[model samples]
Target: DSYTRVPGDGAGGLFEKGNGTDSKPYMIMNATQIRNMRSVLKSGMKVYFQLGADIDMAGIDDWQSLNGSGDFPYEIDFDGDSHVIKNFKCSAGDYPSFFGVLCGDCRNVGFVNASVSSARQGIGIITGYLGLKDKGNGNKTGRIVNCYTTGEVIGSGAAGGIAGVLANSYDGQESYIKNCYSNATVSDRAASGGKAGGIAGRKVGVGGFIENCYAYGAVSATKGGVGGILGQIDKSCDIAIKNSAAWSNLTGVDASSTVGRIVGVSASLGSYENCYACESIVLKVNEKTITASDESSATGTTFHGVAKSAEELGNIIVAWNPNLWKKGTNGYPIFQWSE
Candidate 1:
């Protein structure tokens, strides 16, 4: 059945149609409507929202996060439908993000010219936390797919180009971050950074996987783990990264950090398949010193990413999951939908 598009007043009245179900989702046309959506989510009701047009968040500086964190269980689906949210800036909150977490799903969204400067952790343009489950331990899933973010992510512990953390409490819970990319520059504000990545900073879960994703965000961290794609997987869970590539440049602010081209640390049980990184990875412990080393040197025991040259990367893209990706010009792969 065809559904009618609803437009909000961008003020108090969020939806004129007042139908926020899967069939008739509420439309978000302005920053105020986005804020209203957060307010509605705070009441614990899961709703559907879609972007009606491109939003220019020009003056909203002290923006409150949507959903705060993944601790809440209610799931909402916000489909961007390729509409972009541009010029969003935030500098406060434990999780300074457009969405607090990916309790439900955010698909086909783009955040352009977004900058997050925070002293707290869990910072990203789209989401701060990735996934969470409410009641059941039986494969409650959340996802962030077909999304992209640009600009910069500057903050304390657990900073990412897209989002900060990926975690689930129950054994079977999963968060699938698939078919996404970020060009944001992620760096740390503190010397003792927790984790930092191009796609995400950390992963901790029993069943979550980052598949068919790529990130080229310049990532840097002082301590802990820093990587081109994912920072690290905690020992508590064995999350995996599959069929992905990272072209990010990693910088270990000091020797205390574990830096990698694909991922900083892969837990003992964590794994990856057909993942590629830059052929030349240089991690400098200190900018002044000449202690720069390659992928084998900084990644240590937790390294599982394959290093490929620019030319070889194009060849490998042809062998990647055809449904998800296609070879792009100039030694890169793009989403199959992009074609």
Candidate 2:
């Protein structure tokens, strides 16, 4: 009942097979298709693209992001089909995101050894920016499911392992980042003072929800704050981070900025629900480790969550949606679906 492909798909002729629909998705077979998939599509149209094979993009000099910074947002429904993109590299300030801007959904994809950085902003292996329709009526939504990224994501403005910025436009209802994780060295630092996170660099919407996610990367920022989960939540936003944990080293904060294990600075929507940090998590400012539990400290704080010992944290994570979770080989919680 689902669409699946073999290990290697060639001669499909650049999304030249099947219709761009739910049951008959346009098949993308290689690196060139990944770069040019948006050439024939229109903005804000609900179109589906499915990967046909594992893509190795190491030879590409620079991967051009589709839609160009969400300036022409696509209602993309990209189904990775359990395939991976390996050795993908991109460096540019023109349009961020190794993938592009997303106003839709992306799932079941993995990025391995992706080096995505920007001279300005917008650096995420999946998408540089995630946004919803600016209606303020709570009707439209955008989501990411069962995706992961590993490599280095750095930007002068905003950077993350997943999406650089979950922008608000201050007129949307809710956006969800569920069942995702990132193992990348994410950093954003400049005179502009950008935020960096394992999941998102900056979240700025009314209902920016994160669930069942984990961050295991070394996140840093020289000017602003950094977190294992989120770099910063805008003061105008009311986001909820639940059933998540941080098992990473975080650094780069100043007297004017904040840093933490789960969230460097959140907008406060009842804090967190069942979120925890590990005892081994290295939180730093400059280079010194800190032990912080109060709201005023710079590092080691969870804002509303708690930091637990390694053994206890392992036991704690298994208790969350145990039907779907297993203790991963990386000493983290993972979904049974990951297998």
Candidate 3:
């Protein structure tokens, strides 16, 4: 029979349960261990993580074989409301997935102090599927904080620093992210995507926001649609980012178009304010960049501009505001614009 913890059971085998001093006990449990109890959540129910636990990446098994297509592999799933994932190491793998946290009709969930590393697409949480054509937005939404990711986020579709792929509805589900950092390196294949961004793939809904987040990585895309902080920004009624910054060696293999400091494609009403990209930038470093198979403006722009020195754009930046140009030591502009 399957191991199912009864309601009100103080201890269960469904997931790792920290042994007061360590979290090894719960991390070892898997599908074979807790079968019937895994499907405990309702489709549209709201969930909350009443506690936080730590997971060691190297110590975990069973997830090393995940690619993009497979059985759903989520550390946790919820409908909406709030859930907290705190203190953990997300291990290493190749094409791993189902991802970390799964939500549908879910909102207000949070993952804090959780660290993920070395999965093909290591995400703190997941909102939807990759290369999904007709997938429906379950209004999956939430906030992730103090979560860090490092490793190759090599995916076939929308991948990000915090949430791998965000799935939402046009009905306003209100998803948010804050105070997160991702060091996701990219190795693009045809399905490759989001370098270190807020949203990696498609946006089907509203009320999605990102704030106070940053990414530092050798971020790039093969077929275009890559960004320092957002591969694609949708302009829906509820899509937004504020007070966010991305610092990466951003590049694209597919120079079929232009690359931006923030997003690959700026669509819908998606907006960002008080955002910055610093520590140097690169555009079209490689001439053999790829373009979206979809090849829509929704993915990215063509890299057909000139690169200029920081002093070159000084006049325009000063006219706009000295701060319009990122400041550096001795109050000099670090970023330059080219003709």
Candidate 4:
């Protein structure tokens, strides 16, 4: 099959080969090429992009949006090879808005300057939905790693920079997200109970975990929950987040009981350990409702926000290293790779 160029310029062209396997994965080098593969990508298929390749979608008047609906429930391995895809936009109507319903593994992908707005459900830069709902036992299917998103994600029910919502499979399969981060502006415009988070708006099901991840952008909610990293975790879900940090600000447009720099609300079995947040967090709601957790504090119901100053972060947080993190000119710690 022939592929279409994004800009129709001499720089972009079709993806000439591969059968969607580990050894022979379908190659994608341009935005138009990626759009072409949407119809052909099958379950468990492998897709890889050129290393460090940059695909600009500015020329496309209307980008092809994937709603992860009936014909498309993406469950494939997409390897970005440390490449970047910029100027992404999606508009899925009142149902559960999602770019993909399911994704087996997404790695080394960077999404920049994305602008997604959904009238219902949630919006995510990388994925709209994750994991199966009690489908198989002990079959951990979805994993997202070494990825980052920097853009604007808006939704009605929930909004996340990385994932809108995460749930487990029917038979108790888990979903794991690691070594990832988000710098996008995530907001929930829902009038009543909505969730806005930097990484994930809401997580459901047991055994789902987030580790070695962080959020550096801001998150806001019209009314409901607003968290720097995660909005809320279901009370029955035994999820855990470890070795993570949230250096972003959090805001709530109305009175919200759930607002935190790390997590707005953590269920009974949820755990947050060795996590920290910058003191620059802000909440427009009642301060009593937006209680910030103290560092090293752990609880079963709600995880406290451990706010740290720049000096305390540099001198106290033992997880940070000079090689990967350093004090920035903004008086906060930033990743060296981001510089």
Against the true structure, candidate 4 has what lDDT?
0.66
lDDT of 1: 0.70
Please write out the lDDT profile of model 4 over residues 114-208, one tens digit for every residue. 77788777767777776654455333357777777888888888788888877664544458777777888999989877788889888877667
In the range 1-339, model 1's lDDT, one tens digit per residue, is: 111222343223654344567787777777756656755553455678888878888887657676674465556788987788889887776478887666777898888889987776757788778776333743335678888888999867788888888765455545778777787999865667568888988876666788777777788887777777788777656667777777877787777777766777753456667777766555555563222233332234345377778777666655655665567765566555442
lDDT of 3: 0.41
Which wins on TM-score, candidate 2 or candidate 4?
2
TM-scores of all predicted structures: 0.83, 0.84, 0.56, 0.83
Candidate 1: misplaced stretches above 4 Å?
1-12, 16-18, 69-74, 133-141, 169-173, 288-300, 314-339
Stretches of candidate 2 exceeding 4 Å from the true structure = 1-12, 136-140, 168-173, 253-255, 266-270, 294-304, 315-325, 333-339
lDDT at residue 12 of model 2 (Cα atoms) = 43
Instruction: Please state the error at residue 12 of candidate 1 in Å.
Output: 7.4
TM-score: which candidate is best?
2
RMSD of 2: 5.0
Q: Per-residue lDDT of 1-339 in model 2, one digit per residue for the tens?
A: 112222212224445475667777778778767665655455646778888888888787755676555355456778888778888887764546655667667887878888887877656778777765354433235677877788888777678888887754334445778878888889887554668888988787566678888778888887786777888877656567788778778887665556777777653532467777777777787567777563322323236257777777667766755765577886766656453
Worst 10 residues of 1 by lDDT: 1-10
